[PDB]
UniProtKB/Swiss-Prot annotation, chain A:
Keywords: Cytoplasm, Isopeptide bond, Phosphoprotein, Ribonucleoprotein, Ribosomal protein, RNA-binding, rRNA-binding, Ubl conjugation. GO terms for biological process: cytoplasmic translation; maintenance of translational fidelity; ribosomal large subunit biogenesis. The modification Phosphoserine is found at residues 51, 94, 158-159, 248. This is Large ribosomal subunit protein uL2A. Component of the large ribosomal subunit (LSU). Mature yeast ribosomes consist of a small (40S) and a large (60S) subunit. The 40S small subunit contains 1 molecule of ribosomal RNA (18S rRNA) and 33 different proteins (encoded by 57 genes). The large 60S subunit contains 3 rRNA molecules (25S, 5.8S and 5S rRNA) and 46 different proteins (encoded by 81 genes).
From Swiss-Prot, chain B:
The chain holds residues 62 to 113 of 121 of the full protein. Component of the ribosome, a large ribonucleoprotein complex responsible for the synthesis of proteins in the cell. The small ribosomal subunit (SSU) binds messenger RNAs (mRNAs) and translates the encoded message by selecting cognate aminoacyl-transfer RNA (tRNA) molecules. The large subunit (LSU) contains the ribosomal catalytic site termed the peptidyl transferase center (PTC), which catalyzes the formation of peptide bonds, thereby polymerizing the amino acids delivered by tRNAs into a polypeptide chain. Keywords: Cytoplasm, Ribonucleoprotein, Ribosomal protein. Component of the large ribosomal subunit (LSU). Mature yeast ribosomes consist of a small (40S) and a large (60S) subunit. The 40S small subunit contains 1 molecule of ribosomal RNA (18S rRNA) and 33 different proteins (encoded by 57 genes). The large 60S subunit contains 3 rRNA molecules (25S, 5.8S and 5S rRNA) and 46 different proteins (encoded by 81 genes). Present with 23600 molecules/cell in log phase SD medium. There are 2 genes for eL34 in yeast. One of its GO terms (biological process) is ribosome biogenesis. Its main location: cytoplasm. It comes from Saccharomyces cerevisiae (strain ATCC 204508 / S288c) (Baker's yeast). This is Large ribosomal subunit protein eL34A.
Swiss-Prot record, chain C:
There is a cross-link at residue 40 (Glycyl lysine isopeptide (Lys-Gly) (interchain with G-Cter in SUMO)). The gene is RPL25. GO terms for molecular function: RNA binding; rRNA binding; structural constituent of ribosome. This is Large ribosomal subunit protein uL23. It is found in: Cytoplasm. The keyword Magnesium does not apply.
From Swiss-Prot, chain D:
One of its GO terms (molecular function) is structural constituent of ribosome. Present with 238000 molecules/cell in log phase SD medium. Belongs to the eukaryotic ribosomal protein eL8 family. One of its GO terms (biological process) is cytoplasmic translation. The gene is RPL8A. This is Large ribosomal subunit protein eL8A. InterPro entries: eL8/uL1-like, Ribosomal_eL30-like_sf, Ribosomal_eL8-like_CS, Ribosomal_eL8/eL30/eS12/Gad45, Ribosomal_eL8/Nhp2, Ribosomal_eL8_euk.
Amino acid sequence: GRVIRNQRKGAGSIFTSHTRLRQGAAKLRTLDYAERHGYIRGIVKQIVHDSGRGAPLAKVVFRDPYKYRLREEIFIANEGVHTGQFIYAGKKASLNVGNVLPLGSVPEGTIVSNVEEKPGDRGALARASGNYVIIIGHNPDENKTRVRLPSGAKKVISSDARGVIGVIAGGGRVDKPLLKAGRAFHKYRLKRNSWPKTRGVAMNPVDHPHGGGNHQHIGKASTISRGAVSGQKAGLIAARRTGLLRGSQKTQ
Amino acid sequence: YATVSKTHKTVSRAYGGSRCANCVKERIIRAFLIEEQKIVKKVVKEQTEAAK
Amino acid sequence: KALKVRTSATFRLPKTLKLARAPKYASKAVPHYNRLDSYKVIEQPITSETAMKKVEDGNILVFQVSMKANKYQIKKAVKELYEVDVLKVNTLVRPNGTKKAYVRLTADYDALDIANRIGYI
Amino acid sequence: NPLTHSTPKNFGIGQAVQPKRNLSRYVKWPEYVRVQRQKKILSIRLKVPPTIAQFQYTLDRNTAAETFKLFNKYRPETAAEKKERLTKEAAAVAEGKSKQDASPKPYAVKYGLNHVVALIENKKAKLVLIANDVDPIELVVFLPALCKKMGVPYAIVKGKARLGTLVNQKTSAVAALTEVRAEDEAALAKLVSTIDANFADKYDEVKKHWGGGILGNKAQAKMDKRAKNSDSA
RNA sequence: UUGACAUUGUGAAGAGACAUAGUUUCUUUACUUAUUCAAUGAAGCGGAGCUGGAAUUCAUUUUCCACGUUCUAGCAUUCAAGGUCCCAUUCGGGGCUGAUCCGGGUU
RNA sequence: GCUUGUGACGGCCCGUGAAAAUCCACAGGAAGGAAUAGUUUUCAUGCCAGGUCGUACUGAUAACCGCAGCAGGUCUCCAAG
RNA sequence: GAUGGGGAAGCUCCGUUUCAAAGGCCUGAUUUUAUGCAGGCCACCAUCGAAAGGGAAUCCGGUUAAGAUUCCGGAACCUGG
Ligand SMILES: [Mg+2]
Ligand SMILES: [Mg+2]
Ligand SMILES: [Mg+2]
Ligand SMILES: [Mg+2]
Ligand SMILES: [Mg+2]
Ligand SMILES: [Mg+2]
Ligand SMILES: [Mg+2]
Ligand SMILES: [Mg+2]
Ligand SMILES: [Mg+2]
Ligand SMILES: [Mg+2]
Ligand SMILES: [Mg+2]
Ligand SMILES: [Mg+2]
Ligand SMILES: [Mg+2]
Ligand SMILES: [Mg+2]
Ligand SMILES: [Mg+2]
Ligand SMILES: [Mg+2]
Ligand SMILES: [Mg+2]
Ligand SMILES: [Mg+2]
Ligand SMILES: [Mg+2]
Ligand SMILES: [Mg+2]
Ligand SMILES: [Mg+2]
Ligand SMILES: [Mg+2]
Ligand SMILES: [Mg+2]
Ligand SMILES: [Mg+2]
Ligand SMILES: [Mg+2]
Ligand SMILES: [Mg+2]
Ligand SMILES: [Mg+2]
Ligand SMILES: [Mg+2]
Ligand SMILES: [Mg+2]
Ligand SMILES: [Mg+2]
Ligand SMILES: [Mg+2]
Ligand SMILES: [Mg+2]
Ligand SMILES: [Mg+2]
Ligand SMILES: [Mg+2]
Ligand SMILES: [Mg+2]
Ligand SMILES: [Mg+2]
Ligand SMILES: [Mg+2]
């Protein structure tokens, strides 16, 4: 039978992102000489909405150390940062909201955003509205630093991974009921063509593992194996448990 | 604007037809004060160095 | 002694000697003769009754004219072939796919006079 | 002094555009440059087998200078010189009757890789020079061994082009002597001696020595400072 | 997906046989040039040095950190002004220094 | 009043509602410039030039698509009492 | 959607600034002379893609069997020189 929906997504026909209005990519400064020996001053010139993003961006402009001109960067705004504020990026910089510092130079318990997985990848962890990561350790020999990611996972990276002090702005966005179909609509209209969602169980067998039957039903466990193959993986992929979760989660 | 005489494209003051007067007022004060306060910073830390 | 001193970190393709063509035989033996002389430019009079009217009332010579040729070329070729001064030249493509030039002469000339001197009426 | 002023300039991060410097250490050379450099580098990081690396050990400038000085006399005929010699013999022989021997028995350097080889095999060379370059090295790798077993004195000399200059070819791979005027026989035994002392005599020992295994200096210093501190506190 | 072989090299400790000389083979953990991944109009790397100074001297230095910017929504560009050497004093212009050395491994 | 245009406002958003050519301005001060006469065309007036192709008409119960002068279908502007 | 490229037996597939030695402006130096070198830049890397998006500049009157913001009349405007 037919190619199921989640297999057609990969060719990205109608499925690519809706991009026309976005401000640009959000990235930290290129880890140049200034930022890894000292610090460098900037000014947030504007903090601004990015279409299809939770959290506002911050246009922050700096001086080029090598040419007479202004090079402007796009940050994800931490809560608190403001138009006019001065932002300091660099190893030898100070510990206030908005600045960007290598995880090495921040005491444990420091709370930073947009952190790199390797130094200089211009920012990769905790970028979503609300999210952040907490430094929980340091190992000065082989300068690693340990952090707790938003998920809950703990990871270790180079102490030269840069982060930015604070949490990402616009948090709490997800507490407000969408209330109606049209708001989800306009929501994904600026994201990607993933909405609405026909249930596989309302389809015909050509369409889905779940299709068909004189009543609507999955007709076999909906926990599919990792080893499964494209056209098979709909349902609870590799699910190691299932059912209503009881009692406090929170990783130990 | 290329069919119009340059007086239609400026006012006389420094940063004529580019910035809004009050704004120039402002950056002038800031410029003066910072450059002054700058000198303050230098003779104060010159003092630190020979009195420590 | 010692090395160069590039102050830019981008290396560029050296500006090297561009030599000009000095053949060894010719392109085509005999240059083409002028592909669009005045005689080829301006094809015939147009003597439709309504065209005749533009000649009597407008001081306009109406010619069928080479498709290949432009307003400059039409003007100069009339100027040259008919001893006449020209004010402006409008053109259009007819629907049998041929080009008509309305040619306005300057106020010194009487195109109507000039019509029966080329010899049509 | 005048109405002129000393202003200096602060280039210490976060102020004053950096000035122009020599970024030659940083420029992004064309791939072809990059490749020929790293060929040199990769070629030393690897431990190179003793039948290569007997090269790299080249004859020294002084001895070599003396070893060109000699040879440079014995260049092969010039094009004109042969034209000249022909007409000399073409005329004089065919009439004055001479046995195609109104030419003197010539002494020049012997060259071309294939030529020189069979000369060595026939114990006719007395001094073989082998270039240190030569890119398909195989062309020439067996020559030390060859000479040594034919009991022929040799030397690996800097410059395949320079072996070329003395023979009017762009390059010449190898250059050899087999003949010599009695006036030069002397300095040849002398030349040969030094030369044997640096190569043929040192051959069997060189043959046991691998080469390369050499760190770049960023990771030389790494271990020069790791090995200084660790052991001797 | 899992194994083997090939790409596949260099140390070091440890096991494993001719049966307790080291040619060889795997466990560990080192190395970088293969291979791999990021970055940047391949800009400031690695090493030494100047200065400061914490430091305590068991002869004197045995070291370790530093070694131009943080009240302000300004300004920062013409190989840099200064200093110094040249051209034969013209206007123009050129070294050096300012900005320390050594290695060309962009990081 | 009606249609349209425009202004200063206000509601809305987990939606905050293109790009580039192109034009101007400003910061900068390389430079070039007067008294025996220099500088100035962003002030006025004055001279020359402006190619190529389309341009008719229909746009619908007969000029388009539906075998056709088919009760079907086919994007829009103007709008009196 | 070409291009240094990388795939593919191959028709061709991928890449679009991408692991590329990618290109050109201002005038100076010429008074053998027509344009070599002298600087200093600028490193933007094709191109096609809108007769509703962006966009230099024209209006009234008159005129035809059938054209008209297009001709005639008058009166303007923009762009280049
Ligand atoms: Mg199928
Ligand atoms: Mg996309
Ligand atoms: Mg949908
Ligand atoms: Mg559902
Ligand atoms: Mg559903
Ligand atoms: Mg159904
Ligand atoms: Mg099925
Ligand atoms: Mg199934
Ligand atoms: Mg079913
Ligand atoms: Mg059910
Ligand atoms: Mg004004
Ligand atoms: Mg001024
Ligand atoms: Mg008349
Ligand atoms: Mg026309
Ligand atoms: Mg001779
Ligand atoms: Mg394995
Ligand atoms: Mg780099
Ligand atoms: Mg309307
Ligand atoms: Mg708005
Ligand atoms: Mg303007
Ligand atoms: Mg100048
Ligand atoms: Mg004007
Ligand atoms: Mg033209
Ligand atoms: Mg019409
Ligand atoms: Mg009709
Ligand atoms: Mg029809
Ligand atoms: Mg009909
Ligand atoms: Mg393509
Ligand atoms: Mg186009
Ligand atoms: Mg258009
Ligand atoms: Mg348009
Ligand atoms: Mg007519
Ligand atoms: Mg009509
Ligand atoms: Mg009219
Ligand atoms: Mg008119
Ligand atoms: Mg007029
Ligand atoms: Mg003009």
